[PDB]
Write a protein that binds this ligand. Sequence first.
Ligand SMILES: *[C@@H]1O[C@H](CO)[C@@H](O)[C@H](O)[C@H]1NC(C)=O
Ligand SMILES: [Mg+2]
Ligand SMILES: [Mg+2]
Ligand SMILES: [Mg+2]
Ligand SMILES: [Mg+2]
Ligand SMILES: [Mg+2]
Lengths: 51, 436, 101, 404
Amino acid sequence: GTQERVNNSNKKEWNGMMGELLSGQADMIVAPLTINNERAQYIEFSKPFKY
Amino acid sequence: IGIAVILVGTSDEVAIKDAHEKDDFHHLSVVPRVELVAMNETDPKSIITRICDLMSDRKIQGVVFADDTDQEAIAQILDFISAQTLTPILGIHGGSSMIMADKDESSMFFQFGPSIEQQASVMLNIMEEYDWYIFSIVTTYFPGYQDFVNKIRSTIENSFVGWELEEVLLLDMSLDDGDSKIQNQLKKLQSPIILLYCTKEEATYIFEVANSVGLTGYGYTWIVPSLVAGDTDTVPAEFPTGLISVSYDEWDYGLPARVRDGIAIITTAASDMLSEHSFIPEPKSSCYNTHEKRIYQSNMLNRYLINVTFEGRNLSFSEDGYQMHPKLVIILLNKERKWERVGKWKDKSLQMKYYVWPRDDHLSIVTLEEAPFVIVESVDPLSGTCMRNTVPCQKRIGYIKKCCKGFCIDILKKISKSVKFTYDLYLVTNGKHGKK
Amino acid sequence: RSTIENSFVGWELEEVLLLDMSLDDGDSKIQNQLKKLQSPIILLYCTKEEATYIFEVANSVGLTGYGYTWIVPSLVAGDTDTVPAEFPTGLISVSYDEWDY
Amino acid sequence: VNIGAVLSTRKHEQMFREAVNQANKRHGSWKIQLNATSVTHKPNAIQMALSVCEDLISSQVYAILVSHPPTHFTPTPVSYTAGFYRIPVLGLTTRMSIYSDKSIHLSFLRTVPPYSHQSSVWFEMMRVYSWNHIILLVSDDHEGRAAQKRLETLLEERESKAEKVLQFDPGTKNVTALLMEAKELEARVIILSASEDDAATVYRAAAMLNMTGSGYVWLVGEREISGNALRYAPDGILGLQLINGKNESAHISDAVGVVAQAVHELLEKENITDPPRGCVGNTNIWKTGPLFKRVLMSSKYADGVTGRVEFNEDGDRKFANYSIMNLQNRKLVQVGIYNGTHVIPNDRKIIWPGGETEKPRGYQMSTRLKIVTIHQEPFVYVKPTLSDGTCKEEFTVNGDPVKK
Ligand SMILES: *[C@@H]1O[C@H](CO)[C@@H](O)[C@H](O)[C@H]1NC(C)=O
Ligand SMILES: [Mg+2]
Ligand SMILES: [Mg+2]
Ligand SMILES: [Mg+2]
Ligand SMILES: [Mg+2]
Ligand SMILES: [Mg+2]
C-alpha cells in the first residue's frame, strides 16, 4: 500500500491492503505491515507484535 | 422564435439592434425574431407588468434582461417570475448578473457569473503561481463562508504540493464590545496571505482593525473575492494598497457583446429541443391561469439550455445557474487606487503580467550554474514545483523558473535565515563570472 | 544596557522605544510606534497618568492580552489603594517595604 | 405609522386590528399612533405581489406581517417585493428554513423556528438515552441539507459524528435500495426528514423489509407524522410537535406587540426617513430598514401570549417549546416536553416498535470480520488446496497439527 496519483485530476488514493481497508472491503489487516507516520494518519495501528 | 431583449437605464439601443442582425443562423433552424425594448424605471411592479404584457401579446420563448444598477432584488424577482411562469430568463448585465445560490425549484433563470468555488480555485492558482504556500483564512458569519472553507480544504488536501493553512478565524461581527476579542485574535496571524471573506462594511471595519493591530504592512498580502471589492469605482480609504481580487470581465466584455452569445444559446437550445424531439412547444399566454397556462412540463428544454457549445467554450450552465466556463480577471490596488487589471484566467489557465510580483529587506541575487557550489539541473518534479532543498531561479531570456541547489545555495539560505532578509534568485545571461 | 552587556546570559534587547507625549495630536505616532513590539516581556517607565494613557492606547494593537507581561517601577504605580481601570491584570511592580516596616 | 398584514381570513384581520388597538392603548403615553391595514391572500403569486405593491407599499407601511394558509401560499412574493426597499417582513406560518438565508431573503423575521432547529431537539434525545450510533435519511432538497448540516455540526461539537448520511432524490418513491444498503450498517437508530409523500414511501419500504421490528428506533420531525404519512406511519415512532404553531391569533398578537415596542425605540433617534409612498418610479432603498431590523431583533419582549420573544443572529424564533409524542395503537400521545434546553418525560410509558417497554441499545456489533492478507513466505505460506475442498494436512517436526 502507498499513496499515488491518477491520470485524471489530482485525487489522493491508496492501493493494496491500505486501499482495501480504507474502502471498506476489509475490517482488519493481519500481515507484516510497518508502522509509519504516512499510514498512521488514516488508520490505527496496535502495539507492535514484532520489532 | 420570439426573444425579447429588455434594457433598463441608459444603453446604446442602436448598437444592440445592429449586432442582433449580425449572426449566421444558416447552420440552425430557429428564426430568432428579436424584439428590443428599453426603459428607465426598475420598480418590481413595472417589471412584472412589462413581462406580463409582452408575453401576452407576443410568442416569445426566451427573455434576456439587462440592467445598470446594483440591486440583487432585481435578480430575485426575475428568478421568481421565471419559476412562476416557467419561461427561461437570462441575466447578463447589472444587478440581474449577480450570482445568487439556492434558486427556486423548477426555475429557468440563468446568470452570467462565477460561483464562490471558482473564485477560491482562482485564488489558489494565483497563490501557487508565485510559490505562496503559507496562508490563513478569515471568514465572518455570512452566507457562503462554509462553502468557501470547504472548497479551500478540499483542494489543499487533494494535492501533491505542500500547503500550510495555519489557522481559520470566524470573527463574529455581532457581539457588543467584541472589538477586544477581534483585535486579540487578529494578532495571532502570521502568514503572508490571509484570504479574507466578508461583506464591504465588514471588510472595511476588519481592514481598519488590522491596520491598527499591525498587519497590512510590507510583508503581508490580502486576497479577497469579488464580493468584498464590490463597486470598483468606490474604493474605501480603509482598503490597504496591494489588495488582490478576482472579478468578472467588464472591460473587454461589452454590453453589445454580452447581449450576443446569449440569443445564440436560446436558439441552439430551442433547436435541440425541436430537432431531438421532433418538436419544441412554446405555449405561454400572458402571466396567469397557471393550471391553464403552464399545464405541460417544460423541463425538456432545461437539459438543452445547460449545454450550448456555440462559441463560449461549451458555454456550460450549471444546474445552480452559474456558468462553468466564465472569463475572470485579477485586479490589484495600485498607488492611485484605480483597481488596475493584472492577469486573466480561463479554462484553468493563468496569464499574469508580473513574473516577480513587484512590491526594505528585499534584494536581488545573481547566480550561475557551476560545480556543486551551485546546481541548476532540476526543472520540476511530478508535483510541478521545486523540491525541499531547492530554491526558485528565474532564467531570464523567456523567464522559465527552475530549481537551484548546492553549497552556495545552502550558504545563502542560512545567511538569509540568520540575517532575516528576503531575496529573489535569477541566473546571469551574458558572461560567466566577470571581466573588464 | 550596562547590566545586559556585562553578563554571560543572552537577552538580545529586542527593542527600545522613546514615546513623545508633549506634542498634541500625537496619538497616531504613539500607535504606530507601539506596533513594532513583539517581545513577551515589556518594561515601562513613565508617570501614572502617562501610564494610564499609554495603556488606553494599548489594548488596540493587542499588547495587553494573554502572552504579554508588563513590569513597572514604583513610580508608575503610586497610591496602591487607587488602581486605575486601564492597568492590565497581571502587571508586576517593585515597591518599598511599607507594610512590614 | 401604518402596519400592513396579509391574512387568509377576514376574522384574522379583525383580530389583528384588535391587537393593534390593544398595543395603542398599552403604548398610548407616547404621541405615536399605529394604523392597521389588512389584505387577503390570493391564489396567484403575481396577483399577490401586485396587491402588496399597490395597497400596501403605497401606505408607507413600516413592517408587513404574513401568514401562509395551509391551503402563492408561501410568503416568497411578499418577501421579494419588500426586499427591494428593505422593509422588514414578519412571517408566522412559515418554517421552510429557506427564509433563514440572509443573502436570499433580505430583512425577514419569523415568529416560529424552522424545521432545521428540530435537529437540536434530536441531540437532546441522543444525550438522555445513550444513542451514539445513528443514520440519517435526509432528502436532496435544501431543507434536508440544512438539517443534515445542523446535525453534523452538533455532533462535531460533541466530537462524535454519524456514520452514514445516505440521501434520496425527492419524488422517487423507490427507497428499497437505500434501505437495504443501510440495513447492514450495524446501526439501529434511524433519523428521517422528508415530505409527507416521501415519509409514506420510506415507511412502506421499511415495513416491506421488516425494518420496523424489534431493536429499531425511528425518529422523525413534524411533517412525517401528519397527513397521509401519519396513515402509513409504523407503530413506535417518536414524533415532535410545536406547542403553538397553528394558532395564528396568539402569534399575530405577539408580533403586533413586538413591532409596537420596537417602533417607539426606533423613533427615539434622528435621521429617520419615511418609507416610500408612491412605489411607481422610485428605485432607491428606503434607508429605514437598516437600524430597524437590528432594533427589532434586539427587542426582547417582556412577556407575550406564547412565551418569551427572542431572535437569533439569523432572525428566527428562539427558545421554543416542543411536545415529544409516541405513536401507540394508532393514537399519538405526548410523552415528553422540551422546554428549550432540556427534555423532561412525563409519567406515560413509551411503547417501542417491539413493545419491549425498555429502550433498545440501538447498536449491534458484528461478530464476523473480513481480513485481508498478503503473501509473505516467513509469515504467510499460501498453497493450492486439494481436489476435495481442503489442502493436505501437515505435521511439524514435533508432530503437531499445523493449522491452515
Ligand atoms: C428547562 O428545564 C431545565 C431542567 O432542569 C431547567 O434547568 C431550566 O431552567 C428550564 N428552563 C430553561 C429555559 O431551560
Ligand atoms: Mg448552496
Ligand atoms: Mg484538508
Ligand atoms: Mg457596460
Ligand atoms: Mg445547488
Ligand atoms: Mg504608609
